[model samples]
Target: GKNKLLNDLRNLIEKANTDRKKYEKKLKEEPEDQYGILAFKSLRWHEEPRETVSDNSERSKAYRKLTYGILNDMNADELKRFSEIIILANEVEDIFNTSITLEGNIDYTIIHLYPKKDNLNKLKISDLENLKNLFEKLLSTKEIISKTFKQLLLDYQDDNNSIKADANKLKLHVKEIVKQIKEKQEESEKLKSDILSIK
Candidate 1:
């Protein structure tokens, strides 16, 4: 398994390099595709424009309803397959940490009104510089942790059983870890806000 882990890690490193090159080229070319725009939008923690919690909660509920609606619209088999992928992602979060749970389950249907798009693009160069360190941390964590998890999935594949079945015990653990991740993320963000408020 060491050889397999090494090989998988090498592959992920190469893949990350390729992804960086691709993104760099896209940035240079400056395509009008909405994908990059969406990426930038999503990177912000609070881009939605809702002012009131009630309004935001309303919107969040609608969003989750639509998500489930689409899941149901798909054929049963398709829905099952999609569910598996989602479950796997959730399971991974569980294994990694409880950051996922700390995020909390949002139920509102409201979007918060942040600044305009042009303003966001014009963020201070220093702000982006700060983001660089965060991005480095993000890349390292995902690369090391995700690769190991992928290898685990591959190992279970050889067992001639359902990936779900093979990792049944681990799945329970994953759910708990995801809760921890969410809690920590919330705590960390709260601390960051507290520090900013003193300024």
Candidate 2:
């Protein structure tokens, strides 16, 4: 039972490794500066403002229901200062590590406020700097996440090695038992021949 359990765990970890590799491959292909924008990929700002005021009402209602921190605090006055976005981004990723990331994109809600047009091309050089900084911090964390899974994979690998050793130990023990059983049968035959001349 335990042997099967170890293999099942190995299968799960194998899948995890595959996913990590695919993510790494994709990460390598993407532009270098986009890391900051990717960091906030899952966040929504001010309920996605639209042309219709009434539509905005529902969006704002959703915003009101959500925490005020992300909705209210992520702006130029609040986050544009040096290192502010960096810390908040780490916090944001921490939140994602726990939840929305499911263990995830930047959108117009950000563009309009952080300032945007064409999703990113319209961003000011200063705003673009924040995005790039965000990318740097997340890339730091991205490597962390990737390394975490690498460690997890190796942990299971060690476990499987132990399981292999245990199996070999049992097989050797059983071979000895088989040898002893044959010796006992031979002794019984000799005793029968001695006692009754049956041979």
Candidate 3:
């Protein structure tokens, strides 16, 4: 009887561990690396040398745009301006590869910088396929651990309540089941069958 509880606990632990591993792997392998390159590649300056900015620090400007302009104070146009700056910064990295696919290439990222929905269907980028799929997977799989793990705990809790109803009753149950299981196992083994299958 205790072995049944041990097995259930082990199974739930395994599922929880696997879910976390899968979530981290997707983050490290895709959005952090692949999406970064793809998004960065979308910006360039070779075709026409864009005029250099007034401020020497592009990084500082971008940082302020986000921290000060966007967060400290609120402005949609400010946010829009910040997004445009990033898109421009990204294009520079693609100067080398744009030509190969340049005859015609369609971009799939959403026009609006902010994503409103948590849905899987609404956020997919045709070019950055994994970025979307794996993003949703990260969220969705974490939910799996949350859903199933909570469910597992629910069963464990219910079982605890049952077993703890009365200490004497639980001892009696252990003794009774052990007494019954021994005879059942021996008879079942006469022809051979799974003992764990019995209630």
Whose lDDT is greatest here?
A: 1
Could you give the candidate ranking by lDDT, starting with the highest?
Answer: 1, 2, 3
lDDT of each: 0.35, 0.32, 0.30
**Worst 10-residue stretch by lDDT in candidate 3?**
102-111
Q: What TM-score against the true fold does each predicted structure earn?
A: 0.30, 0.25, 0.20
Total residue pair clashes for candidate 1: 37
Give the total clashing residue pairs for model 3: 6
lDDT of 1 by residue, 87-197 (tens): 554442233223222212110100110112123234444443333333334344333433433444444444333545645654554454345445444554543343233
Give residue 132's error in model 1 in angstroms.
Answer: 5.1
lDDT of 3 by residue, 75-159 (tens): 3343233233324333222221221121111001111112322222333234134333323333332233223323323333365
Which runs in model 1 stand beyond 4 Å of their true positions?
1-117, 120-124, 131-168, 172-199
Better candidate number, 2 or 3, judged by TM-score = 2
- TM-score, candidate number 3: 0.20
Q: RMSDs, each prediction?
A: 14.3, 31.7, 26.7
Model 2: per-residue lDDT, tens digit, 88-132? 324433332222121111111121223222234444454444444
